[PDB]
Amino acid sequence: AAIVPTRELENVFLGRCKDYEITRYLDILPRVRSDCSALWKDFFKAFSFKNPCDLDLGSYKDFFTSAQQQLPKNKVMFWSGVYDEAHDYANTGRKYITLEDTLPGYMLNSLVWCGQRANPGFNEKVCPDFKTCPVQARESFWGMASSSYAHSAEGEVTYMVDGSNPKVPAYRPDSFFGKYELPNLTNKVTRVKVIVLHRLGEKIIEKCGAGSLLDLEKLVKAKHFAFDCVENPRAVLFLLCSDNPNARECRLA
Amino acid sequence: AAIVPTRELENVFLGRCKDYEITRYLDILPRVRSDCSALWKDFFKAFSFKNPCDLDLGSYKDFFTSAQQQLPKNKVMFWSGVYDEAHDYANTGRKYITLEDTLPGYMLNSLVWCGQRANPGFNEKVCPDFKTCPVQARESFWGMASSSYAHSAEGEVTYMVDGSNPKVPAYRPDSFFGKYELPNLTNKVTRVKVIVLHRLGEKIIEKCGAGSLLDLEKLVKAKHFAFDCVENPRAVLFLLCSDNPNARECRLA
Numbered sequence: 001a002a003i004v005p006t007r008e009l010e011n012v013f014l015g016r017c018k019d020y021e022i023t024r025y026l027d028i029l030p031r032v033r034s035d036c037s038a039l040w041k042d043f044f045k046a047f048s049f050k051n052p053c054d055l056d057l058g059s060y061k062d063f064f065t066s067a068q069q070q071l072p073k074n075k076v077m078f079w080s081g082v083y084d085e086a087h088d089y090a091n092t093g094r095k096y097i098t099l100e101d102t103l104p105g106y107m108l109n110s111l112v113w114c115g116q117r118a119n120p121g122f123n124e125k126v127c128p129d130f131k132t133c134p135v136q137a138r139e140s141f142w143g144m145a146s147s148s149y150a151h152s153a154e155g156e157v158t159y160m161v162d163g164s165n166p167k168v169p170a171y172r173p174d175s176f177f178g179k180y181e182l183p184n185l186t187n188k189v190t191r192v193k194v195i196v197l198h199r200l201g202e203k204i205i206e207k208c209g210a211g212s213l214l215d216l217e218k219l220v221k222a223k224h225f226a227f228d229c230v231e232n233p234r235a236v237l238f239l240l241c242s243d244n245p246n247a248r249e250c251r252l253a
Numbered sequence: 254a255a256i257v258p259t260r261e262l263e264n265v266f267l268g269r270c271k272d273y274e275i276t277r278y279l280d281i282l283p284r285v286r287s288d289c290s291a292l293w294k295d296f297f298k299a300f301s302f303k304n305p306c307d308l309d310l311g312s313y314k315d316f317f318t319s320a321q322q323q324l325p326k327n328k329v330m331f332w333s334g335v336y337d338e339a340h341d342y343a344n345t346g347r348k349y350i351t352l353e354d355t356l357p358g359y360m361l362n363s364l365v366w367c368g369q370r371a372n373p374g375f376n377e378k379v380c381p382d383f384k385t386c387p388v389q390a391r392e393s394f395w396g397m398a399s400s401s402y403a404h405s406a407e408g409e410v411t412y413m414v415d416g417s418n419p420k421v422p423a424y425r426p427d428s429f430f431g432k433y434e435l436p437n438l439t440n441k442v443t444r445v446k447v448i449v450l451h452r453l454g455e456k457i458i459e460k461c462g463a464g465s466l467l468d469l470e471k472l473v474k475a476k477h478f479a480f481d482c483v484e485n486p487r488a489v490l491f492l493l494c495s496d497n498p499n500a501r502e503c504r505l506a
């Protein structure tokens with residue numbers, strides 16, 4: 001494990017960008033004003049010719065400004081600890097939007113990149129363990145992405161959490177949700193709908209109305225939002241049951 | 254009576270190629286030897302500067318010879334009628350490979366294009382509907398696509414079909430599957446396993462052992478493959494029930 005940057009970053013970013021422009025999410029999400037080139041100048045300038053750890057929460061502000069899309073009322077989803085589950089359920093924009101569906105999220109998803117001072121101004125060979133930079137440098141991209149996404153959310157929002165992780169509560173201030181989403185939700189949000197995942201054949205850790213979720217309910221209420229919570233709603237249980245068919249909580253009548 | 258084609262077709266095609274090339278199906282599918290630019294050559298030369306209907310089964314043969322990646326033993330799936338449920342089940346290469354997960358597939362999926370013979374060799378305004386073009390010109394691309402895909406399979410293959418369509422038999426000789434995939438399976442293939450879909454709260458139309466599935470079962474046995482069949486296997490079913498959780502077919506116990 002040495003962190004390997006994405007080869008041909010500009011070309012890959014440009015590809016993804018053009019592809020999304022013309023063919024992805026057309027009626028689910030609006031297009032952005034900026035061409036794929038300017039977005040690049042914007043994304044490049046933020047990290048290039050600077051040291052890997054030489055970045056703040058303001059670095060990519062210009063990019064995120066060009067790249068923000070109006071988000072559909074009531075359809076915005078945040079997730080913690082449940083990447084595969086939340087994304088199957090959200091269903092590629094069809095049921096809910098996730099960051100990964102937005103242009104910015106789509107473009108940069110799974111990509112690895114960093115600066116250097118020497119020409120060319122980005123490092124194509126190696127990249128530092130993120131644990132070695134200042135948090136605001138290491139969070140500077142996806143933190144600002146979350147912030148900007150949460151800011152744009154209107155209506156009901158939905159949040160999917162993991163209620164079975166004995167080592168990690170369903171809700172925590174130190175997650176990205178906790179740090180960058182929940183506190184950035186505007187007064188154009190009305191209700192927070194929490195979906196709690198209860199892993200098949202695993203012990204239930206976080207019940208709804210107790211521990212960290214109650215903690216969360218208090219915060220939601222404090223922000224003058226409406227709040228509700230569900231544990232394993234049907235629609236979701238079945239997604240679950242598909243990968244673990246012979247599972248107990250999937251006994252068909 | 255006529256359809257609009259995909260804007261900036263080459264940008265889309267290349268962009269896609271580079272995103273596939275660098276970032277998609279890495280642990281799952283291998284890369285091709287050709288530069289993106291070369292894939293764009295064999296491909297454009299097929300339909301370019303011709304009547305929109307001047308296409309046949311061989312037109313794109315070089316493109317499909319180029320874009321052709323070996324396929325992993327046993328993970329290869331065909332479908333007819335059941336698109337979303339098939340790609341849902343397959344799970345973006347995790348459980349099965351679809352034609353759409355492959356380089357040629359990925360690239361052109363959903364795209365609309367057509368030659369004209371005047372500059373620039375393609376029409377950017379308008380293009381023919383389905384029935385408007387002859388059978389071999391309508392099926393030149395996706396049929397040749399299906400051809401190689403099939404030619405390349407090994408071990409167990411998998412066929413998912415619609416068993417609830419009064420208008421269209423689960424199996425057909427004149428489907429893309431029956432015209433192009435089936436005839437081109439090789440002695441390296443050993444078994445064809447069918448999945449019959451039975452849409453929820455809809456009336457069963459076809460069953461294993463019968464109708465076109467029996468026709469099919471014989472055709473298999475005659476090319477010397479083992480055969481197998483199942484109707485709404487639990488794993489499949491649960492996906493279906495996630496969209497219609499209220500349906501009788503999946504009352505929990």
Ligand SMILES: NC(=O)c1ccc[n+]([C@@H]2O[C@H](COP(=O)([O-])OP(=O)(O)OC[C@H]3O[C@@H](n4cnc5c(N)ncnc54)[C@H](O)[C@@H]3O)[C@@H](O)[C@H]2O)c1
Nearest residue numbers: 077078079080081082083099100109142146175176177178
């Ligand atoms: N798509 C992304 O690259 C990305 C990653 C994390 C979070 N987010 C945003 O914030 C929320 C999810 O993150 P969270 O912290 O609340 O829960 P989280 O703790 O589950 O986020 C971690 C998950 O995101 C990816 N990831 C792993 N390590 C990461 C790292 N250190 N930095 C960023 N992502 C990492 C993995 O899929 C991982 O399982 C979502 O609502 C989303 O909007 C986006």
Ligand SMILES: N=c1c2ncn3c2ncn1[C@@H]1O[C@H](COP(=O)(O)OP(=O)(O)OC[C@H]2O[C@@H]3[C@H](O)[C@@H]2O)[C@@H](O)[C@H]1O
Nearest residue numbers: 330331332333334335352395399402428429430431434
């Ligand atoms: N890639 C396509 C494709 N792309 C668009 N379409 C495709 N059909 C088949 N294929 C391929 O042949 C098989 C399905 O063909 P067919 O049984 O005719 O699909 P069907 O379910 O009969 O085809 C459904 C519709 O989708 C169109 C068809 O022209 C038709 O308009 C698949 O395994 C796939 O490999």
